[PDB]
Paper text:
All family members function by signal transduction to the nucleus of cells via interaction with effectors (such as RAF, RALGDS, and PI3K) that catalyze phosphorylation of downstream proteins. When KRAS is bound to GDP, the protein is in the inactive state and becomes activated by nucleotide exchange from GDP to GTP.
Initially, we wanted to establish crystallization conditions to obtain a crystal form that would allow free movement of RAS-binding compounds through the lattice for crystal soaking. All six crystallographically independent chains (identified as chains A–F) have the same fold. Noncrystallographic symmetry averaging of the electron density maps allowed the assignment of all of the polypeptide backbone for switch I (in all six chains). Switch II is more flexible in this crystal form and a complete model could only be built in three or four copies of RAS per asymmetric unit. The solvent channels are also much larger, facilitating compound diffusion; consequently, bound compounds have more freedom to be accommodated within KRAS169Q61H crystals, and the structures are more likely to represent the interaction in solution. In addition, six independent protein chains are available for binding of compounds within the asymmetric unit, making this crystal form particularly suitable for compound-soaking experiments. A further comparison was carried out between the switch regions of the two full-length KRAS structures (G12V and G12D) with our new KRAS169Q61H structure (amino acids 1–169). Both KRAS169Q61H and KRAS188G12V lack stabilization in the switch II region, and this instability could be attributed to the lack of a Mg ion binding to the switch II. All of the comparisons and observations between different crystal forms and mutants led us to conclude that the KRAS169Q61H crystals were the best option for crystal-soaking experiments.
Numbering used by the authors:
A (entry chain C), E (entry chain F): -3 to 168
B (entry chain D): -3 to 61, 65 to 167
C (entry chain A): -2 to 167
D (entry chain B): -3 to 169
F (entry chain E): -3 to 62, 64 to 168
The structure:
């Protein structure tokens, strides 16, 4: 019997300063955070309707650089789906993506972990990572790619909702 | 791909005067209709959330008292079979509604809920136990309702949606 | 703001008083006619109470349970308690004292958010008068609400009132 | 041009103790008030959907007996529709209804004022006003009658929603 | 009396590849479809509140080039309002608009059919159709013009809600 | 006791043509108004959820250039103010200090909930630098948000941020 809404555990990962927090806060509060306040670990909750199903999103916002690596392994084990975020004006953040992905696959001992590749800050004019390169990378992993802006809200709901759909597909 | 909410086609049947319209209008408008205006055929819609899933209920309210009857039985996915707990004849009619539905749909396992309406009234002629035994014999849920007090109204419709979902 | 406020509610009272039926009416808008004894079950629902969005975590307990350290442990997680009796069952009403003492013991406090709930008000076999229950609640400084899980009278109100009691305490 | 939801100013009137406040608080908070705390004047707001239209209910809960009569005139002038409440166990409250209706018509200087007759406390066993008598009275005025219980919530939404429907009919005249 | 929400039958028309599907999917799923999968015929539904009225939108997503022309006439007869979509980087799609409009008017035997002119892909830098020219075209038909991006979601709700308002004006 | 949702009286001020109406209509109707129809006075309402609290927003849309007793009246009744300039209109930005001083004078307070709004951020012809606006907002101790009534960038955020500023002030 139904005891309450389905819950999804989402984890947002990626390099320092790519906009992990800004994406999450835009989703939760409809607020753009202009300041750069480095994260240690924050967790958020939101109830949404996706494809006609009520969902409770539990979202873990992670540090760009995680010092205690056992803590990183713990959230990778518990997370059901991952947003892997880079910034489209930060080539290094893009090159870091494969490390996040490998870490997740290693910890979960699986090649098929729900994930979405997110190219954030698409509102900025100084793009250094081409859409084509990101799409090719996502295709090589068999995952969706979405361009986002925490500032304009382009793609924000879509990135989170797409990840829930990937989790749902994986469980079906 | 998701093209919009799930739709459920529900049909409310039973003898004249048992409260089919009053149940439906209570669900849709939160209004109790005190007058008895016999129905020909009316259809209503409401979006609800049941067990975390959004769905569009299409509800067909039928006349108590035949090609038109067959047509709505064919299109219906689930049926509320309503009698009034102060009307023994309406209860005895339930067997006929059930057989008609099974015949038309060519199925033994058609989502249905047995509804004993007007449970607010003191002059009960149909025992709860008798209705429960009948529902058990059909393998369907039984619910007592009052379109006047709203007791069991949402439950009757939501239960029927749950029966459709089980069947699908 | 990291998301809605959560409230941990625990439903206690004697065997058969309608703790599960009240909870399932809240969650599913369904009346359960069958009596399936509970050990421990948990439910969740988001509601709006006094303009504030709340996530309710509801723990539905066993009415017949000997001393358990494990019982004490889950009860200690509760922020507020519905203490339920049935208005046709005098012994369930007399057992309310025991539930109240248990809650005070486990929470190690005299001031625990609670609501007294007199369930099955639809039945003709009332043995506990409204005034007696109101007097008991007044003696504890808590609200009394009469409910019927069958008609749904007072169901939302019992849970929402408990949330208001928790908010007052915080 | 849409500037936000339509607002309806609803006023709840009737004799002392008939359950005006209990009805309103049941609507607003889903809470039954067992205590009898006599009202002076309180205002409540709730957004609801009625017949597919979103609207803001501004509800003025009044005193049974209003001492300052200019204050009474003021809310009757501003009110767009009125719930006239009696209690089904209180014959005097029912006999008062005609006078509340006449007071409203006098203040508004109109014969066609949106109103609903509400017979409250229908959960109680010692009924002194028969349903038929209330229905006959409502029919004589051309208005809806609804039986309510602020305790069980029977008819509560219906009473308020029906009044909004009466206001809409009057406005669409 | 009231038997449940008002239903509006909306039809999305225009040249191949202008973003008819992408607009509809953005509205329904808050998802941007990056791939180009040519449509035959798809129908979608959504309940929304527009100007305080609860509406059930039935949206018919059409093919750019309709081969069976009796099928085209049938959906034009049943549709209550039309989004006529072009892409602001595709001059040909803009020059085609008058053909779609004439088809609709011919089938409905009316000069007063609820319609909105939609200039889609306004996120792209390679604009070939000037806003002023589109506004002038809309003005010549007596209909609203809205610039949209199925990608950023700019104007998407507005285009559909504006069409519902046009239908309501025609019904009253 | 709870009598229904909390109401917030918001007032939108700023020079003629900066997009006060367009911002408000975007919020209320999800509609971008392309035409320039000068405002006299309009009031709008919307119920929203902000940080888990249901709020009724009462929004007063004002004339760029005002009868000054009428101006004083809405400034007295307003609980919070969006002070709007257009990022392509230097003069509208220079006017901001006058609106702020008027509000502080009328409300006889140095601590009035306000948000500085740089509107039309979709346009390419920017004449007011973000740094200058941020410095000005910081000098007043208020939030700064860039908006576009056209793209809807920042629109909800401007109004919701102002409600959060009012809530902070009311404790
Ligand atoms: N223009 C623009 N700036 C953005 C966007 N997302 C984030 N930023 C900015 O980039 C900076 C870093 O954002 P932040 O969310 O803190 O990054 P983070 O990835 O959470 N960092 P950390 O790993 O240290 O926790 C902030 O100044 C923020 O305003 C975006 O989409 N567009
Ligand atoms: N007391 C009470 N009266 C009820 C209840 N349900 C319906 N009624 C009353 O019974 C009468 C008939 O109800 P109605 O809805 O019209 O019945 P129906 O089954 O739709 N009739 P038909 O088959 O002619 O369309 C009315 O006077 C109505 O108010 C109920 O639960 N309790
Ligand atoms: N008439 C009526 N029966 C009720 C009501 N609430 C519960 N019941 C019935 O009482 C029986 C026991 O209810 P239930 O919810 O299982 O009780 P419980 O308090 O959860 N029992 P346990 O402690 O063993 O888990 C069931 O048959 C149920 O239908 C009520 O308000 N009215
Ligand atoms: N049983 C029952 N009691 C009710 C009902 N409505 C109100 N009461 C009770 O009757 C008493 C008076 O109710 P209240 O709402 O204060 O009445 P009022 O009309 O607002 N009084 P006043 O005119 O002084 O403000 C309270 O004790 C209340 O609990 C009802 O439907 N059922
Ligand atoms: N950048 C951008 N691309 C868009 C936009 N809308 C659509 N596209 C892209 O344009 C292509 C065609 O879009 P699609 O929705 O299939 O077009 P259509 O009008 O439905 N095609 P058809 O008539 O064949 O069914 C896809 O690659 C899609 O991603 C938009 O607003 N911006
Ligand atoms: N590109 C763009 N144009 C905008 C934006 N906001 C407003 N405009 C345009 O600017 C013009 C003036 O907008 P309007 O809302 O009337 O300004 P106002 O500040 O309310 N004027 P007034 O003080 O006379 O009432 C209109 O043509 C409108 O479309 C925006 O964010 N971007
Ligand atoms: Mg961070
Ligand atoms: Mg009928
Ligand atoms: Mg139990
Ligand atoms: Mg009162
Ligand atoms: Mg297509
Ligand atoms: Mg203006």
């Amino acid at each position: 019997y139904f005891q309450g809404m389905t819950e999804y555990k989402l984890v947002v990962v990626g390099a320092g300063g790519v906009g992990k927090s800004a994406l999450t806060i835009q989703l939760i509060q409809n607020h753009f955070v202009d300041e750069y306040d480095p994260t240690i670990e924050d967790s958020y909750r939101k109830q949404v309707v996706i494809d006609g199903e009520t969902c409770l999103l539990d979202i873990l916002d992670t540090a760009g650089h995680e010092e205690y690596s056992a803590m990183r392994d713990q959230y990778m084990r518990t997370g059901e789906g991952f947003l892997c975020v880079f910034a489209i004006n930060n080539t290094k953040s893009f090159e870091d993506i494969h490390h996040y992905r490998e870490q997740i696959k290693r910890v979960k001992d699986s090649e098929d972990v729900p994930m979405v590749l997110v190219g954030n800050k698409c509102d900025l004019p100084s793009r250094t990572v081409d859409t084509k390169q990101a799409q090719d990378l996502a295709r090589s992993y068999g995952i969706p790619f979405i361009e986002t802006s925490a500032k304009t809200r382009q793609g924000v709901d879509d990135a989170f909702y797409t990840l829930v759909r990937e989790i749902r597909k994986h469980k079906e």
